[PDB]
Amino acid sequence: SGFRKMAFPSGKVEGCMVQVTCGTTTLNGLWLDDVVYCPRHVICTSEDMLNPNYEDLLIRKSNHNFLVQAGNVQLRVIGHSMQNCVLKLKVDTANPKTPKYKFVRIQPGQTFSVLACYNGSPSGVYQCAMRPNFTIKGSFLNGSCGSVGFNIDYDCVSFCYMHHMELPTGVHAGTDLEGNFYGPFVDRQTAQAAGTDTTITVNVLAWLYAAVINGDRWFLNRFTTTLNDFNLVAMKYNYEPLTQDHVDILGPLSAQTGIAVLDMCASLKELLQNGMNGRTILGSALLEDEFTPFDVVRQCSGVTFQ
Amino acid sequence: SGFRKMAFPSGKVEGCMVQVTCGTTTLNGLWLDDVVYCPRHVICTSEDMLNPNYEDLLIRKSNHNFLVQAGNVQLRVIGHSMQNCVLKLKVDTANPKTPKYKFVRIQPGQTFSVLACYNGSPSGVYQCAMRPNFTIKGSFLNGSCGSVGFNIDYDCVSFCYMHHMELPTGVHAGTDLEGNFYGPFVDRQTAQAAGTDTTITVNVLAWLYAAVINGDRWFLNRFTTTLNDFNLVAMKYNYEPLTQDHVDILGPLSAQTGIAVLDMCASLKELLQNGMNGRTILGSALLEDEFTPFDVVRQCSGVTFQ
Numbered sequence: 001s002g003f004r005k006m007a008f009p010s011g012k013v014e015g016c017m018v019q020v021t022c023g024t025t026t027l028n029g030l031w032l033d034d035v036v037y038c039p040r041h042v043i044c045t046s047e048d049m050l051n052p053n054y055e056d057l058l059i060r061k062s063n064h065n066f067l068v069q070a071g072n073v074q075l076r077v078i079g080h081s082m083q084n085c086v087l088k089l090k091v092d093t094a095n096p097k098t099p100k101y102k103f104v105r106i107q108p109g110q111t112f113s114v115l116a117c118y119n120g121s122p123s124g125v126y127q128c129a130m131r132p133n134f135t136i137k138g139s140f141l142n143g144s145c146g147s148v149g150f151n152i153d154y155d156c157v158s159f160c161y162m163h164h165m166e167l168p169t170g171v172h173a174g175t176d177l178e179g180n181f182y183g184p185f186v187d188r189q190t191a192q193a194a195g196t197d198t199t200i201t202v203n204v205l206a207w208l209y210a211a212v213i214n215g216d217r218w219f220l221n222r223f224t225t226t227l228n229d230f231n232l233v234a235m236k237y238n239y240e241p242l243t244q245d246h247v248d249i250l251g252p253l254s255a256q257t258g259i260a261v262l263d264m265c266a267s268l269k270e271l272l273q274n275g276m277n278g279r280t281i282l283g284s285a286l287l288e289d290e291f292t293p294f295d296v297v298r299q300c301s302g303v304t305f306q
Numbered sequence: 307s308g309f310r311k312m313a314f315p316s317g318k319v320e321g322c323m324v325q326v327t328c329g330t331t332t333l334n335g336l337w338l339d340d341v342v343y344c345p346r347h348v349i350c351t352s353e354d355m356l357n358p359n360y361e362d363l364l365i366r367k368s369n370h371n372f373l374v375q376a377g378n379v380q381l382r383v384i385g386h387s388m389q390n391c392v393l394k395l396k397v398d399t400a401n402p403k404t405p406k407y408k409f410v411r412i413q414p415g416q417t418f419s420v421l422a423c424y425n426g427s428p429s430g431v432y433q434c435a436m437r438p439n440f441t442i443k444g445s446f447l448n449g450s451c452g453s454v455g456f457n458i459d460y461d462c463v464s465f466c467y468m469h470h471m472e473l474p475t476g477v478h479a480g481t482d483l484e485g486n487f488y489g490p491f492v493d494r495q496t497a498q499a500a501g502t503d504t505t506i507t508v509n510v511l512a513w514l515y516a517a518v519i520n521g522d523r524w525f526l527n528r529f530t531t532t533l534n535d536f537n538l539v540a541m542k543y544n545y546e547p548l549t550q551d552h553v554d555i556l557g558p559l560s561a562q563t564g565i566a567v568l569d570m571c572a573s574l575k576e577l578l579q580n581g582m583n584g585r586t587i588l589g590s591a592l593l594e595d596e597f598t599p600f601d602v603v604r605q606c607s608g609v610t611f612q
């Protein structure tokens with residue numbers, strides 16, 4: 001027992017991180033097979049980032065202007081192309097450490113691990129969620145761009161995020177591995193307002209189930225509710241609406257605990273209306289929303305990777 | 307910017323995890339050079355764990371009774387010895403993935419990463435602290451024993467923890483890699499009371515400095531205090547006493563922020579006496595104590611490993 005914010009083991013992804021330098025800009029690249037993926041803003045000067053025309057900036061770049069370093073080895077660039085907001089740099093050597101992998105575009109409320117890197121070297125790993133406003137609350141310093149977010153299903157790494165931008169408010173924006181930003185964000189140093197950071201209701205309910213499984217039961221109340229009644233209250237507290245699809249996904253945690261999903265919704269409703277009265281749940285004084293139902297099952301059943 | 311509970315990248319340690327089976331008991335081992343380290347309670351039956359005599363149980367074990375599996379390969383055991391509460395199993399093959407490593411015994415309040423494993427396979431990585439009562443608040447299920455805690459200094463892994471026990475209260479006990487338990491705990495299924503889980507004051511102050519660096523400044527007050535005045539208040543709230551050694555260690559964060567350590571102590575004192583009034587600091591509604599000063603500097607300066 002015990003319940004922790006747990007990242008995937010990072011070894012498979014560590015073996016894919018490289019350094020990419022264009023002129024005076026250095027950031028991280030992801031080396032899979034004979035392609036290195038990196039943010040296209042590697043081609044920009046600080047000045048350019050105000051109003052970059054990426055197609056025009058690319059005209060003045062050749063294969064030999066992209067410096068790709070894997071530890072101590074230079075990789076030979078034999079081709080480059082822009083796909084949305086990423087560069088694909090073709091190299092003459094397939095990464096010998098390429099794991100089985102996929103590129104997936106995730107939905108808001110889905111969680112993933114980030115391997116924060118500087119100069120192609122891993123600094124740390126942590127668990128994130130795609131927020132409902134399509135930002136993530138990461139830990140990223142200058143030079144972290146091209147750090148990736150991923151999930152692992154046994155031996156297959158699903159890459160879902162590449163880091164591109166910090167907004168003026170200190171939250172983070174980036175792309176999938178096809179270079180499409182999550183949400184309305186652009187790779188330009190302009191005014192980009194994040195919308196309302198709503199709470200991922202289905203994830204709070206998952207984490208309440210995790211709490212019960214781990215013996216933290218004080219918040220279980222004597223009530224039930226309906227989806228409509230719950231959603232009227234949830235909306236007021238900037239909670240995402242709960243759907244029948246969400247209820248269905250929580251079914252297995254409902255069965256393991258014997259607590260009906262709508263009963264757990266009525267417990268949550270009372271926590272929202274009454275607060276935690278200075279109590280904690282799984283060592284938190286607020287309602288955690290960065291565990292999915294799949295995460296809770298995974299961590300509570302000890303599923304393995306390799 | 308942004309501030310996350312960040313683990314070390316786990317790849318170096320993933321390459322060291324094996325499965326150890328003795329009779330009907332399976333747990334995890336750590337394979338470094340030609341030695342596998344695992345909890346000695348691998349030799350116990352559920353029945354034995356009530357009152358085990360490990361020396362007597364060991365008499366009935368030979369090298370060929372320890373089944374060591376590294377993925378699909380069996381390792382040949384050519385020697386075994388008991389060191390405190392760990393078994394050292396000599397194998398005929400040096401781990402080709404052995405990183406540079408050390409065995410260190412940590413002090414209460416020090417943090418480390420845990421790679422939670424089942425059947426010698428990594429499930430997840432998370433950051434822990436050695437509590438002042440020498441427990442850790444982990445995430446461990448049956449089969450997790452022999453999972454390790456570690457820190458990395460560039461290319462050298464410092465192993466500081468091996469998982470052995472869950473106490474009746476659902477907190478965790480284990481050893482250093484010489485097999486000496488942290489605190490008074492024993493590898494016996496008996497009544498073992500954890501003492502007071504005090505808050506690691508120096509770590510709370512580090513995290514307050516992290517908050518200021520990341521622009522979360524609302525709690526900065528107009529007061530200062532002294533070590534004695536602060537410590538009288540801290541004691542009342544089951545905070546560890548702050549020493550001049552602690553003040554000295556916070557010196558660099560003091561200098562970067564221009565906030566005197568005793569000023570930050572007076573801010574903390576007001577948070578203890580007044581609570582957070584429903585506000586958050588770095589997205590937490592309680593005072594986080596599982597970041598060291600070295601962790602804050604590391605995460606705020608983007609230090610790298612490889």
Ligand SMILES: CCOC(=O)N1Cc2ccncc2C1
Nearest residue numbers: 140141142144164165166307
């Ligand atoms: C000029 C100082 O730059 C920063 O502080 N950054 C840029 C940057 C870019 C992407 N993620 C995080 C950060 C933090």
Ligand SMILES: CCOC(=O)N1Cc2ccncc2C1
Nearest residue numbers: 001446447448450470471472
């Ligand atoms: C009989 C059921 O056993 C458990 O629930 N454990 C044992 C155990 C041993 C070490 N860490 C965690 C756990 C959780």
